[PDB]
Amino acid sequence: MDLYAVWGNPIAQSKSPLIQNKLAAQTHQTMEYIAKLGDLDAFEQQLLAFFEEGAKGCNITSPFKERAYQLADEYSQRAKLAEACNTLKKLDDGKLYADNTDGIGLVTDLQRLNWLRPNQHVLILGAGGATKGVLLPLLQAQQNIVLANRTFSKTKELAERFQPYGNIQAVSMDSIPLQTYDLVINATSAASVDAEILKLGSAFYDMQYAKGTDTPFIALCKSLGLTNVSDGFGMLVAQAAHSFHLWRGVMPDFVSVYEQLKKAML
Amino acid sequence: MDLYAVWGNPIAQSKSPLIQNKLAAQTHQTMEYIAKLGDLDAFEQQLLAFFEEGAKGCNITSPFKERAYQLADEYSQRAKLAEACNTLKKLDDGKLYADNTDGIGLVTDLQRLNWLRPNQHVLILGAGGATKGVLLPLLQAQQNIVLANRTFSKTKELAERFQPYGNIQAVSMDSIPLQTYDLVINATSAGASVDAEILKLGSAFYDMQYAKGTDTPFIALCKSLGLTNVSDGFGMLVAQAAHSFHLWRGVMPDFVSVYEQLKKAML
């Protein structure tokens, strides 16, 4: 039985094991996926011990995404641009291959929703957080991106990095260009925008999801009469499927688990 | 001899008489076309007399477009949207019919250039009161339009009005959505330069103005920037006159060949 794990701090909160084991059961894979708490100082050496032990790969969450990427021997264009990775794969020789599966999970979910038509204008609220891991694949799907953040320095540096891949610009959250947006993506944790701005959007995607209830962002949209909305639960299951495909060579059907899970929560 | 004219002030610079008489000759129409200088105050009463003595129709330029439109009995969708007209026709009954051919002159020319694909993204610079006549025909040709001006006040009013007819929005000169534009139109009349970063977003460039022999400043800027796919608006001028002709006469003259003929021997 091949072992896999999600590494983080904290970790009890994770849904990856839940997702990944279901994906495995669904495709008759002889594997298991567990949750591993990484020590803030000792992670890297725990991680390497975990691989010597015989693990085949793992997901990485806060706060070691950047550190785990630094352990990779080989890495994807996605991981490179994000300077972080959420997925590691141990190759047969013993090399570690790193990829960042966030963005492609997002594009998949948006494609499911038919919210990723080429040449759209997307307003993204919030930088860093989950957005830098997501910009490259959005850009490659020909999305024209406006990146807004409360602190300008953050968006600007992010825009400079991704500029060679498409039309992307940095703006201050209070200085958002008064143009039509096909899609507004909320990255921010735990908003910061005036409502008319949101009334420039045709669609609203929160990279957050809440169990049962709506997220604060989605609640805001709905109270503004903006109904064409979605949370990011689909993005979460999609990322997981992509890491799974990289590890196993089999794309599990993305929808079904998303649904059973959708159903279970509500 | 059916009489037609162009009414303006000033009017001595109009090429209408030259274009129309050529159009009439090529289609064998027994008609004449003269330039008439309208008095800044008595225009209206002059136009009515003029029709009263038998004129069958005319063209209108500054500053009478809006005033001519308000005299009509009958009018087209193009006239109503620009709240002005460049073409009047006296119907058999006695009704005055107003139309505005400039936008259709524009689409016709763009067809000749093959710069008019359905669902294209078109950036229009300096769109205002003088050129709102091109908006409807562009929208009706399924063009996606962005209006940029130093306003986004007056132009946002434009966007609102043309919203029921297609995709059009107004933006600040610095809030131009970042994307490839298949067509960039200079609507600014000379009465300056654009960020080169704006211009590099376009694949084709059309100046609604034209100049005798040389290039216009907008076109010269484009060439200097390396942007080689360019056109002035001479074709629009001839095309819109052909459309006025067609309304008055019932035969669509040969725009493409009066145009090329007129470029060969131009200046």
Token look-up 């000749």 returns B112
Looking at the domain that runs over A115-231, which CATH code has it been given? 3.40.50.720
DSSP character for B62?
T
Residues 126-155 of A with CB under 8 A from B: 144, 146
Name the catalytic one among B36, B56, B65, B200: B65
Q: Shortest CA distance to B235 belongs to which of B213, B206, B215, B214?
A: B206
User: Exposed, middle or buried: residue B229 (CB in 10 Å: 0-12, 13-18, 19+)?
Assistant: middle
Domain ranges in chain B with CATH number 3.40.50.10860: 1-114+233-267
Fold that domain B1-114+233-267 belongs to in CATH: Rossmann fold (3.40.50)
Token look-up 């109904």 returns A227
d(Cα A86, Cα A77) in Å, to the nearest integer? Answer: 13
Taking each helix axis from N to C end, the angle separating B16-26 and B234-249, rounded to the nearest 10 degrees, works out to: 50
Looking at the domain that runs over A1-114+232-266, which CATH code has it been given? 3.40.50.10860
Q: Shortest CA distance to A91 belongs to which of A246, A263, A260?
A: A246
Which residue in chain A has the smallest CA separation from B147? A179
CB contact under 8 A, B169 and A177: no
CB contact under 8 A, B175 and A180: no
d(Cα A86, Cα A101) in Å, to the nearest integer? Answer: 6
Return the CATH superfamily for domain B115-232. Answer: NAD(P)-binding Rossmann-like Domain (3.40.50.720)
CB contacts of A165 in chain B (<8 Å) are: none
Consult the annotation and say whether A75 binds a ligand.
no
d(Cα B166, Cα B142) in Å, to the nearest integer? Answer: 7
Q: Is A208 on the interface with B (CB under 8 A)?
A: no
Catalytic (active-site) positions of A? 65
d(Cα B167, Cα B165) in Å, to the nearest integer? Answer: 7
Catalytic site includes residue B56? no
Q: Shortest CA distance to B90 belongs to which of B57, B43, B63, B114?
A: B57
Adjacent-strand bridge partners of A59:
A6, A87
Backbone angles phi, psi at A212, to 5 degrees: 75, -75
CB contacts of A201 in chain B (<8 Å) are: none
CB contacts of A199 in chain B (<8 Å) are: none
d(Cα A121, Cα B133) in Å, to the nearest integer? Answer: 28
Return the structure tokens found at B226: 């390396």
Consult the annotation and say whether B202 binds a ligand.
no
Domain ranges in chain B with CATH number 3.40.50.720: 115-232
Token look-up 């026709």 returns B89
d(Cα B88, Cα B244) in Å, to the nearest integer? Answer: 9
B84 CA: distance to closest CA in chain A (Å): 29
Consult the annotation and say whether A36 binds a ligand.
no
Q: Structure solved using which method?
A: X-ray
Domain ranges in chain A with CATH number 3.40.50.10860: 1-114+232-266
Taking each helix axis from N to C end, the angle separating B255-264 and B102-112, rounded to the nearest 10 degrees, works out to: 80
Distance of CA A7 to CAs A50, A60, A232, B238, Å? 10, 5, 21, 71
**What resolution in angstroms, rounded to 1 decimal?**
2.4
B51, B91 Cβ separation under 8 angstroms: no
B172 vs A167, A168, A178: nearest CB: A178
Distance of CA B116 to CAs B1, B179, B185, Å? 38, 18, 12
Return the structure tokens found at B90: 């006296």
Instruction: Say if strands A57-60 and A87-90 run parallel, antiparallel, or are unpaired.
Output: antiparallel
CB contact under 8 A, B172 and A180: no
B229, B205 Cβ separation under 8 angstroms: yes
Domain ranges in chain A with CATH number 3.40.50.720: 115-231
Q: Is B175 on the interface with A (CB under 8 A)?
A: yes
CB contacts of B175 in chain A (<8 Å) are: 177-179
Q: Is B7 on the interface with A (CB under 8 A)?
A: no
Rounded to the nearest 10°, the torsion over CA B173, B179, B184, B190 is 10
